[PDB]
Amino acid sequence: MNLTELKNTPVSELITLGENMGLENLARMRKQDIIFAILKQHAKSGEDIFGDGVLEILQDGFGFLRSADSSYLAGPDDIYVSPSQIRRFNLRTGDTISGKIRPPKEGERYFALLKVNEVNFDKPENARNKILFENLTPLHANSRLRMERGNGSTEDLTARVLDLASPIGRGQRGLIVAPPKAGKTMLLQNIAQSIAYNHPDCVLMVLLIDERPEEVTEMQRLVKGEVVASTFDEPASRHVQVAEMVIEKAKRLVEHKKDVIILLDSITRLARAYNTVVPASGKVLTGGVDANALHRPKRFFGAARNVEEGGSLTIIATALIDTGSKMDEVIYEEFKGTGNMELHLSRKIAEKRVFPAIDYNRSGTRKEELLTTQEELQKMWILRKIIHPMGEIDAMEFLINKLAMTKTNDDFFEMMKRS
Amino acid sequence: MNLTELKNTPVSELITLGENMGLENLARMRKQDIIFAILKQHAKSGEDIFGDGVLEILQDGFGFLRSADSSYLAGPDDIYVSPSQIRRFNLRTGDTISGKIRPPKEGERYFALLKVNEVNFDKPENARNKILFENLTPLHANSRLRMERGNGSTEDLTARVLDLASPIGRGQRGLIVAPPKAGKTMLLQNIAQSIAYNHPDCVLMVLLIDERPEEVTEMQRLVKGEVVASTFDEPASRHVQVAEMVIEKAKRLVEHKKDVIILLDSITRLARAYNTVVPASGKVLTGGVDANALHRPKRFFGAARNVEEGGSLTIIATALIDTGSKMDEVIYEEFKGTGNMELHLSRKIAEKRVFPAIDYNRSGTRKEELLTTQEELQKMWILRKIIHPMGEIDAMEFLINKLAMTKTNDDFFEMMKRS
Amino acid sequence: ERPEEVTEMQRLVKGEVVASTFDEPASRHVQVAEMVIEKAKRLVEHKKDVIILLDSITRLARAYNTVVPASGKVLTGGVDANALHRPKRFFGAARNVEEGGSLTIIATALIDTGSKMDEVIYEEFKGTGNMELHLSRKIAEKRVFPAIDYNRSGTRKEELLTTQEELQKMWILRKIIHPMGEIDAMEFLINKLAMTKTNDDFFEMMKRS
Amino acid sequence: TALQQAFDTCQNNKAAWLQRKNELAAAEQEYLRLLSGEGRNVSRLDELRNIIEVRKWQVNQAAGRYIRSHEAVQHISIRDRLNDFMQQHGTALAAALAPELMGYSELTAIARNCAIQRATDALREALLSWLAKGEKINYSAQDSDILTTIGFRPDVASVDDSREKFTPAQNMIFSRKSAQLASRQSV
Ligand SMILES: Nc1ncnc2c1ncn2[C@@H]1O[C@H](COP(=O)(O)OP(=O)(O)OP(=O)(O)O)[C@@H](O)[C@H]1O
Numbered sequence A, B: 001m002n003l004t005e006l007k008n009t010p011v012s013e014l015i016t017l018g019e020n021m022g023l024e025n026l027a028r029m030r031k032q033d034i035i036f037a038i039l040k041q042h043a044k045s046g047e048d049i050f051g052d053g054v055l056e057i058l059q060d061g062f063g064f065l066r067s068a069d070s071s072y073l074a075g076p077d078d079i080y081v082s083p084s085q086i087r088r089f090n091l092r093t094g095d096t097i098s099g100k101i102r103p104p105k106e107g108e109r110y111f112a113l114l115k116v117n118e119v120n121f122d123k124p125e126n127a128r129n130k131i132l133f134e135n136l137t138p139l140h141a142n143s144r145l146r147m148e149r150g151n152g153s154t155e156d157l158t159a160r161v162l163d164l165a166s167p168i169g170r171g172q173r174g175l176i177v178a179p180p181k182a183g184k185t186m187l188l189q190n191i192a193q194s195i196a197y198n199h200p201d202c203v204l205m206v207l208l209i210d211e212r213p214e215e216v217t218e219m220q221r222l223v224k225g226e227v228v229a230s231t232f233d234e235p236a237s238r239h240v241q242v243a244e245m246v247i248e249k250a251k252r253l254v255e256h257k258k259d260v261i262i263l264l265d266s267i268t269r270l271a272r273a274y275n276t277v278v279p280a281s282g283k284v285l286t287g288g289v290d291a292n293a294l295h296r297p298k299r300f301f302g303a304a305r306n307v308e309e310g311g312s313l314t315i316i317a318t319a320l321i322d323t324g325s326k327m328d329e330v331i332y333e334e335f336k337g338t339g340n341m342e343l344h345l346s347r348k349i350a351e352k353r354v355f356p357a358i359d360y361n362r363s364g365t366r367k368e369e370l371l372t373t374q375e376e377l378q379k380m381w382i383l384r385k386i387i388h389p390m391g392e393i394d395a396m397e398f399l400i401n402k403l404a405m406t407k408t409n410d411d412f413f414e415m416m417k418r419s
Numbered sequence C: 001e002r003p004e005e006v007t008e009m010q011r012l013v014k015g016e017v018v019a020s021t022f023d024e025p026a027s028r029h030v031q032v033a034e035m036v037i038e039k040a041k042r043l044v045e046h047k048k049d050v051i052i053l054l055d056s057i058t059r060l061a062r063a064y065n066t067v068v069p070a071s072g073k074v075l076t077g078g079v080d081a082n083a084l085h086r087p088k089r090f091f092g093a094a095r096n097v098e099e100g101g102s103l104t105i106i107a108t109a110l111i112d113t114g115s116k117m118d119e120v121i122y123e124e125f126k127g128t129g130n131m132e133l134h135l136s137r138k139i140a141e142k143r144v145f146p147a148i149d150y151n152r153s154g155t156r157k158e159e160l161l162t163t164q165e166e167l168q169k170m171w172i173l174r175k176i177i178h179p180m181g182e183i184d185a186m187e188f189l190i191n192k193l194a195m196t197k198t199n200d201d202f203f204e205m206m207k208r209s
Numbered sequence D: 001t002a003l004q005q006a007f008d009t010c011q012n013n014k015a016a017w018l019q020r021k022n023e024l025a026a027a028e029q030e031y032l033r034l035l036s037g038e039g040r041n042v043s044r045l046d047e048l049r050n051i052i053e054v055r056k057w058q059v060n061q062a063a064g065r066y067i068r069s070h071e072a073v074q075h076i077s078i079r080d081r082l083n084d085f086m087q088q089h090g091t092a093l094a095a096a097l098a099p100e101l102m103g104y105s106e107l108t109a110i111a112r113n114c115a116i117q118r119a120t121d122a123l124r125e126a127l128l129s130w131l132a133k134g135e136k137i138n139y140s141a142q143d144s145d146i147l148t149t150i151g152f153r154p155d156v157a158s159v160d161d162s163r164e165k166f167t168p169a170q171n172m173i174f175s176r177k178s179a180q181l182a183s184r185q186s187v
């Protein structure tokens, strides 16, 4: 068989089929151990097995190959890759690999690679002639992503007002400022599913770090696209490793003319993990945070750009404020104006039973002219001018009850001027 | 010979039984030595001997069976088990094993096991075929837990406000942010006794860390459910090992379709023990906490979850604040977002002779809309809206003077909404 | 302690007092402390009430730390886990026996001595006792003694120790003395109770004048 | 026949309250004997004061429980007597207050409650006549003897000690005092 179908199955049928084929008392061990034993038995039987995953290289070329479904766990099922084929094919970290896998022999405990049939959904020789991500020229978000599904979903409202507040374009830098208990997770999953529905072509990735396991599994269930999530149980080292793996996979994939967007929940937690994972540089910013450590999140957050040659990498991230700690405000101030698109969430607007809890007056976008049309831009700026004089309570409730009396956004666009 | 009640019973009848056959002067050594001596004397006469315990494996398979009622002390009464039978009958850490016990021979001083007649409170045949706890997919809380006893007891009043403050659900990580002198101990034992008196089917466990012996024995003689209390006597090694063994036992019990609720007090002391027991990793955070000193508490606290089928494990832990220690502050800060519900024990409420000290405006719950009925849900919402504006002292007074005069929670709702 | 204090105590106290100056090494202190605590344990085993005054826990812990073998894990300030576990057995004997006898331990601790490990082990000893009272340098500077701080001091579960009316008196005193500062409240209470004869008379003259 | 059980409960509550009263008196007398006994004994004096405090608290609790049992006995006797009398003379007083109860029949809840309260005030005005003239009346002869045993309302000795009220915290701490008293008395 292949690792692809083995990984994405509940352990029930897996253990039943393992018992039917017959390995051992295969109940009391890890799922990765069960998969390893099944693969060992199948290899001993004599049938060839395919393999696929995402490749990473250590500091000495000791290459590993992990799987996205298992959240890049360092289990025994990871494929070993020697530096020989790494140099022969001139591959690096983040290159998706698939091909024949060599069963392990004596002296090693990891499955090896016989041959690779394709790399990053492309031929091994064709993908070699590609330039690095940093060699491209950034450009503004020319294309427009619309969150309106068009089916008039009753829960689509949170997305609709977003198009009326912050237009979304490919290759932009998105940041979200949200206090705790602001309904940001549901908004993010709504955005992800709207993107998957309206734009099935673009590759969707959702990254979760140090989140609750229930949130992780509901992200897995709800999102049709693949979602990578590392919980808080593992130390910050694994969070750093998985974040680097995801960002480098996105960088390697965008060169194949793929529009890739990735979620970041949250930038503050990733920055904290970077701060607590790196050694002290001798200079510490006030409060107890290393200034040098903040260089690491930028590498993750500075890749949001649009490429004229093709492809567009988009980073949409959320940030935490008023959490009671001092780190969150320091991270917010560090990432104050580093992104070209920001969306504000507020707590007082959330505690009055109106959602989404978007602060329309403060939240905004940059370079809307080249991103959307003209007349719609003028009409929405007129709407913003109407919203501005009043506060956030009346404006938000008014917008919510006005967007609920019709279905089509175009119909809403043609009703305020008539009255 | 069902050594359970032999260990449970006090020392007077044990001394009389030991002196029945004139076993020298056994009123001087430890209880474990007395039990070992009487067990060897009964075994030497040829009668069959039975024993039960909780399994903990060493680094070489030299497994030990500890006694729950002995506070998991590493005394001579622990039952030795060989790796061979562990592999044959599929034994793991935290499992409960009962059966025939082999008398020791020359070369060893610990009782072995002849044949186990029960493991994990069911047949050993189907016990070996069980799914690991971490392999089960987590979910959100589904079953509501009512802290109200319903008998209108004056002691239940505080529990009543708990149902009005934050509902308790299965697989819910609960935080009790309680500074010293906040009345959390009797609140915790009230919660435990309410759970025992309202949900006898659900397995109730209480965990005490480095607590004074008087409180330990008060808890032991108060709650009918069994309580594990690592006292203030032993060093951090025993605390961390007993915490690991009890959490493994809880996982093993919940793997068998059993609901388990564990109360812990306090998580700050457990984190302190983990920090002082972990070897230095070379990266020290502010407050003298290692970079890996949080891995163990995070892994312990993230265990609680609601599985897709079977029993659920729920952890309620108490965290201290304003103790004058910076590491307490940092562990509380890193433990803020890891729980889906928390109650604040406001200090200012304590000195006003109004109890329980609940900062109702600050405290809250998450995902409660999918837990309770929508009618009482919106009733709680309007109650929260009513209580939100005014201060904590007067809100607590207004809640107490009207909840004490009524009978039950729904009666309180009816009387407050009729006026 | 110095020989002066131990000699004046032994010539001033009524019951027998165990003492050991610093002229002897730390091992002498360790052995005398352990033998005293186990002797008191035996005395309370024989259903006899025994009270142990400890002065001071910080110095005893320091001696234990200096004498304990290193287990390879040393905390900040040159303190080991066993270095604090050894004095823990001496300090944790305070408990009550329901069928007869009692073993009460009252101990003093040193802070602001110029060594940070002193306050570290004080913090480790912050939540181990059910009764605490502090002494402030500034209160003693004003030459008013004892330099006790009423707001800071407290007793855990003092309701069971005293009666209801004494509890009411204690808590009305708490409410009266809590708002104002420490030195002014201390001098006010000491001068208002100085003219009295007994505590009950003071309570009676303050409750309704 | 639950009236007999209620009467027995009231009687044993009264006996327990009398036991509490006499033991409290014994504690008070021994305490006052020790007051003039001299020789300090501060710990003994404090423990005896705690003993007498818990004794008087449990005396108050027993008196309150006895009063509650007595009033429950009165209520059950009243309801049983009224039930049997209504089964004996229902029609006469049903026709005395006829029109409201005849129009009652089947109506809405508000109308039914209004009719019930109209009947209650009508019978109040009816009973006011004998409330004014008020000749002497004795207990029902069927079960007078039990009513003879309880007689009138509970005596002043059972109510003079129930004047004060205790907050739930007081109840909890005094229950702890009683529990430790029992634990130390058992040994
Ligand atoms: N439109 C809405 N209708 C009903 N409930 C809503 C709506 N928007 C938000 N909520 C409520 O807001 C709550 C906030 O929980 P949620 O998990 O979404 O928070 P978050 O802002 O993502 O952050 P965190 O999970 O860290 O608290 C949800 O439990 C949900 O019940």
Ligand SMILES: Nc1ncnc2c1ncn2[C@@H]1O[C@H](COP(=O)(O)OP(=O)(O)OP(=O)(O)O)[C@@H](O)[C@H]1O
Residues within 6 Å of the ligand: B158, B178, B179, B180, B181, B182, B183, B184, B185, B186, B355, B356, C156, C157, C158, C159, D169
């Ligand atoms: N419902 C209540 N009614 C009356 N008193 C209460 C109530 N709840 C708490 N208290 C008081 O709160 C005090 C707190 O004592 P306790 O030692 O148990 O507190 P804790 O919060 O567990 O913390 P710590 O043990 O560190 O002091 C108790 O002595 C008790 O008098």
Ligand SMILES: [Mg+2]
Residues within 6 Å of the ligand: A183, A184, A185, A186
């Ligand atoms: Mg969220």
Ligand SMILES: [Mg+2]
Residues within 6 Å of the ligand: B184, B185, B186
């Ligand atoms: Mg406590």
